[PDB]
Each structure stands twice: as structure tokens, then as C-alpha cells.
Design a protein around this motif. Structure first.
Motif, PDB file in Angstrom:
ATOM      1  N   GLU A  58       0.824  -1.208   0.000  1.00 22.77           N
ATOM      2  CA  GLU A  58       0.000   0.000   0.000  1.00 22.77           C
ATOM      3  C   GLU A  58       0.857   1.256   0.000  1.00 22.77           C
ATOM      4  O   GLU A  58       0.487   2.264  -0.612  1.00 22.77           O
ATOM      5  CB  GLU A  58      -0.933   0.012   1.212  1.00 22.77           C
ATOM      6  N   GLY A 103       5.395   7.334  -0.787  1.00 23.79           N
ATOM      7  CA  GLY A 103       4.675   6.066  -0.703  1.00 23.79           C
ATOM      8  C   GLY A 103       3.190   6.257  -0.455  1.00 23.79           C
ATOM      9  O   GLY A 103       2.356   5.499  -0.964  1.00 23.79           O
ATOM     10  N   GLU A 104       2.835   7.267   0.334  1.00 26.27           N
ATOM     11  CA  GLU A 104       1.420   7.534   0.570  1.00 26.27           C
ATOM     12  C   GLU A 104       0.731   8.050  -0.685  1.00 26.27           C
ATOM     13  O   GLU A 104      -0.396   7.642  -0.996  1.00 26.27           O
ATOM     14  CB  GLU A 104       1.265   8.522   1.714  1.00 26.27           C
ATOM     15  N   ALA A 105       1.387   8.938  -1.425  1.00 27.39           N
ATOM     16  CA  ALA A 105       0.785   9.446  -2.649  1.00 27.39           C
ATOM     17  C   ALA A 105       0.714   8.380  -3.723  1.00 27.39           C
ATOM     18  O   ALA A 105      -0.126   8.471  -4.624  1.00 27.39           O
ATOM     19  CB  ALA A 105       1.565  10.657  -3.163  1.00 27.39           C
ATOM     20  N   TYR A 106       1.573   7.369  -3.635  1.00 30.12           N
ATOM     21  CA  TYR A 106       1.664   6.334  -4.650  1.00 30.12           C
ATOM     22  C   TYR A 106       0.376   5.524  -4.732  1.00 30.12           C
ATOM     23  O   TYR A 106      -0.046   4.904  -3.752  1.00 30.12           O
ATOM     24  CB  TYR A 106       2.845   5.431  -4.316  1.00 30.12           C
TER      25      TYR A 106
END
Ligand code: HEM
Ligand SMILES: CC1(C)[C@H]2CC(=O)[C@]1(C)C[C@H]2O
Ligand SMILES: [K+]
Length: 405
Positions: free
Chosen positions: A75, A84-87
Motif C-alpha cells: 500500500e 509512498g502515501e501518494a503512490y
């Protein structure tokens, strides 16, 4: 700078590696990452760089983590956390079971049946570019071949104009080796901005290009949404523009520096498929990761829910425990072990196209330009990131030693 050490991380595990600017980058980026495998370093370390995250340094742990998607979720697969969060690319940002339906659709545009389709266009373009360079006795290999060859194949496959390459290459560069002009989220936003009107047009008037196939495709029966199609096409753009492009330069730099390995392939062209594999191991170049879904004790280390762990695909094959003498290139390696194309349920879907582009390049370049070197006095610089790369690669040869076929 360094993020404060979280309470649950013991001090004897701290090793402040910077994946975007490693200390010994001057020696080669793969060598710079291999300092994580020296005898003083534990199998699992914490770096306070880039917000703080774990690093698995050994193929055994890297493989185990990529297999255990219940504990190690994709995730949030990029470091730093804000990237990583925007991914949200598909299928990479999804865990099984949800992930799997999208792999079949992606396989429709880059799968092995399609690669056999493009076989002769790939051959035709490689030969065309190399013969154009052959009489010059020199080139800037990154700009003159490593970029045009894979990228023009991808843009034809996707039905996108070649004039858009500089814009799109800038954006994918910022997602993998940021120079600081854009955050990952901003580059991702700009990529989707490019894609949204194209997706809309090709769902109304569909065609035979990859964007049309993805945008009008089905996902285990039901239609794909416009948003899912955009999140898949974003991923395909990054793969087509950043992977083979950078790998080809590591490979050609090695051959230009190693006349003996060149001659081995000229003398023995049938070893070129094996050499491709041994070069994919030695010059492996991707490093992404996972996020912990729960507290979990992993190889005697206490990992906390929400911790990020970098699982460098690059490091498995350079691990001496998987390949004896790992920094030496040996085209006759008995068992070439690596995770250059990933491991587990997210194994690279483009790897068949990648191998064909690499093998076609080697065969066709060595045929016409068997004898080449680094330009005299040139110092080759590497750059590190999610996908590592070569800044520039000036090559030189005597046009008299060349052959037109
Ligand atoms: C040398 C060339 C390449 C290398 C080393 C490479 C490496 C990788 C790696 C390591 C992963 C797994 C990522 C993870 O588990 O988080 C991956 C996934 C993927 N790659 Fe490649 N790649 C290459 C070329 C390509 C190309 C040219 C494409 C063209 C579209 C492509 C499409 C994909 C896709 C769609 C996935 C996602 C599979 C999934 O998440 O289920 N790759 N690649
Ligand atoms: C890690 C990757 C190289 C891999 C999955 C990603 O998000 C990439 C950046 C593009 C694709 O090939
Ligand atoms: K995310």
C-alpha cells in the motif's frame, strides 16, 4: 538530515544509509549499496535518513518479506513516506487478492504474446539507430540510444507522440531520482494530468494502442473504471521510460570497460541471453519497499505497525550468500540468482519486453560496433534512487573496425 530515533529501534541497529545519495556513490551505485553487506552490518538495519526506515540487506530476508504480503503491504511501497502515501499505481499499490485481476489486463499490453508481436519492430529500430551511429565513431550513449530505443518502442506501443518524450521523461525522473524541483505527489499529479484527456478520448474512440486496451479492458469480468485505467497507465509510463533506459547504460558501460567480456560475446554470440541474465544480476537497479501492517518480530528484530522497510531488489543478487564472487561478472555462472524483476506476487510484468530489448541491443550493437571504449578522460557518474542510473556515457570507436550488415 536525520530523523529522531524511534523508541522501539535499538541503537546497535542504526546504519544511516541514504538511498538517494549513498556515501560511496563515486565507486559505482551498486558498490555504494553493497556497503550494506559488509561484515560489520546486520541483516536488518535502521537508517534515520529520508524520514527513518528499515533496510533488509540480504537476499533471504528480502525474498521472505516480498512473499509475506500479509505483514509487508505494498500500500505504501516508496520511501520517503510522503511519496509512498501518494503512490497509487495499479497493480503495485495493491495487495492480493485485489491486485491479481489487474495483472491479467496489464499482461494484455506487455505480456509475452505481445512481445513476439513487436519482435521485428524492436529489431528494426535497434538496427536503425545503431547504423546511424556507426560511422560517427562516437556517441553519448544515454541520449543517443539508451533513451530513444526503449522509449520510442514504448511510445509507439502506447500510441503517444514522440514529441512528448522530454516532458514525460522529466516527470518520471522526478518520481525515481528527484532533483528537488518537484515532489513525488506533484510529479504524479502532472502525469495523471497528461493521461486523463487521453484516457477519455480512447474510451469514446478506442484503438489498438496500449492505452486503448487498458482503458476499454475488463477486470475479472467487470469494466475497468476511468480512474483505474489512469492508475495503470501511469505505472506503464514509468516502466517504459525509466527501467530499460537506465539498465542499458550500466551494461554498455561495463562492456566498454571490459574488452575481454566484449570479445567473449563477439567470439560467442550464443552466450548473449545468458550474459543478459548475469548483467541483470550485477547491474540490478530497482529499490522499493513495503509497510508493516502490524507489529511483527522479523529475524529477531521488532518491527512496528506502520514502519517502512526498504527491500532492495538490487541487493539479492549482489549478496555473496546467493552468488559466489558477486561483484565479478561471469557469463558462465552456473546458477544466476537475483530478484532484479522483483519477487512474489508483484513480479515484473514488463520483464519479457525488457529482456528482448536488452538481448536485441547486445546482438545488434556488437555486430556493427564490436570494439568500443569509454571516451578518454571521462569519469562516469552514477545516480541513486528508486531506479538508479547513469548520468552520461560517452563512447568512442574506430569507424574502420565497424561493419554495416
Ligand atoms: C530492466 C527493466 C525492468 C526492471 C529491473 C523492472 C523491475 C521491476 C520490479 C522490481 C518490480 C516489482 C516492484 C514491487 O514489487 O514493488 C516491477 C513491477 C512491474 N513492472 Fe517492471 N521492471 C523493468 C521493466 C519494466 C517495463 C519496461 C515495464 C513496461 C510497462 C514494466 C512493468 C511493470 C509492471 C506493470 C509491474 C507491476 C506488477 C505488479 O505490481 O503486479 N517493467 N518491475
Ligand atoms: C519500481 C518500478 C520500477 C516498478 C514498479 C514501480 O512503481 C516502478 C518505479 C516502475 C515499475 O517498473
Ligand atoms: K499509497
Amino acid at each position: 538530515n536525520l530523523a529522531p530515533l524511534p523508541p522501539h529501534v535499538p541503537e546497535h541497529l542504526v546504519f544511516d544509509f541514504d538511498m538517494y545519495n549513498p556515501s560511496n556513490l563515486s565507486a559505482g551505485v551498486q558498490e555504494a549499496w553493497a556497503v550494506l553487506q559488509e561484515s560489520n552490518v546486520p541483516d536488518l538495519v535502521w537508517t534515520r535518513c529520508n524520514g527513518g526506515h528499515w533496510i533488509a540487506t540480504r537476499g533471504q530476508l528480502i525474498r521472505e518479506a516480498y512473499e509475506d504480503y500479509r505483514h509487508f503491504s505494498s500500500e505504501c511501497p516508496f520511501i520517503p513516506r510522503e511519496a509512498g502515501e501518494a503512490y497509487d499505481f495499479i497493480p503495485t499499490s495493491m495487495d492480493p487478492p485485489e491486485q491479481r485481476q489487474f495483472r491479467a489486463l496489464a499482461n494484455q499490453v506487455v505480456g509475452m504474446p505481445v512481445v513476439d508481436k513487436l519482435e521485428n519492430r524492436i529489431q528494426e529500430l535497434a538496427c536503425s539507430l545503431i547504423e546511424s551511429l556507426r560511422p560517427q565513431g562516437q556517441c553519448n550513449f544515454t541520449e543517443d540510444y539508451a533513451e530513444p530505443f526503449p522509449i520510442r518502442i514504448f511510445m509507439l506501443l502506447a500510441g503517444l507522440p514522440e514529441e512528448d518524450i522530454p516532458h514525460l521523461k522529466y516527470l518520471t525522473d522526478q518520481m525515481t531520482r528527484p532533483d528537488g524541483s518537484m515532489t513525488f505527489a506533484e510529479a504524479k499529479e502532472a502525469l495523471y494530468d497528461y493521461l486523463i484527456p487521453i484516457i477519455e478520448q480512447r474510451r469514446q474512440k478506442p484503438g489498438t494502442d496500449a492505452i486503448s486496451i487498458v482503458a476499454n479492458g475488463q477486470v475479472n469480468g467487470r469494466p475497468i473504471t476511468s480512474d483505474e485505467a489512469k492508475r495503470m497507465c501511469g505505472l506503464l509510463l514509468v516502466g517504459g521510460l525509466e527501467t530499460v533506459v537506465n539498465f542499458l547504460s550500466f551494461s554498455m558501460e561495463f562492456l566498454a570497460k571490459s574488452p575481454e567480456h566484449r570479445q567473449e560475446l563477439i567470439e560467442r554470440p550464443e552466450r548473449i541471453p545468458a550474459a543478459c541474465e548475469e548483467l541483470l544480476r550485477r547491474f540490478s537497479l530497482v529499490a522499493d519497499g513495503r509497510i508493516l501492517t502490524s507489529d511483527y518480530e522479523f529475524h529477531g528484530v521488532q518491527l512496528k505497525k506502520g514502519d517502512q522497510i526498504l527491500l532492495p531488489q538490487m541487493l539479492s543478487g549482489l549478496d555473496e550468500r546467493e552468488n559466489a564472487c558477486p561483484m565479478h561478472v561471469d557469463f558462465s555462472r552456473q546458477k544466476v540468482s537475483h530478484t532484479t524483476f522483483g519477487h512474489g506476487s508483484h513480479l515484473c510484468l514488463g520483464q519479457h519486453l525488457a529482456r528482448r530489448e536488452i538481448i536485441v541491443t547486445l546482438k545488434e550493437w556488437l555486430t556493427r560496433i564490436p570494439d568500443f571504449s569509454i571516451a578518454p578522460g571521462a569519469q562516469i557518474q552514477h545516480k541513486s534512487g528508486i531506479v538508479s542510473g547513469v548520468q552520461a556515457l560517452p563512447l568512442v570507436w574506430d569507424p574502420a573496425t565497424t561493419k554495416a550488415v
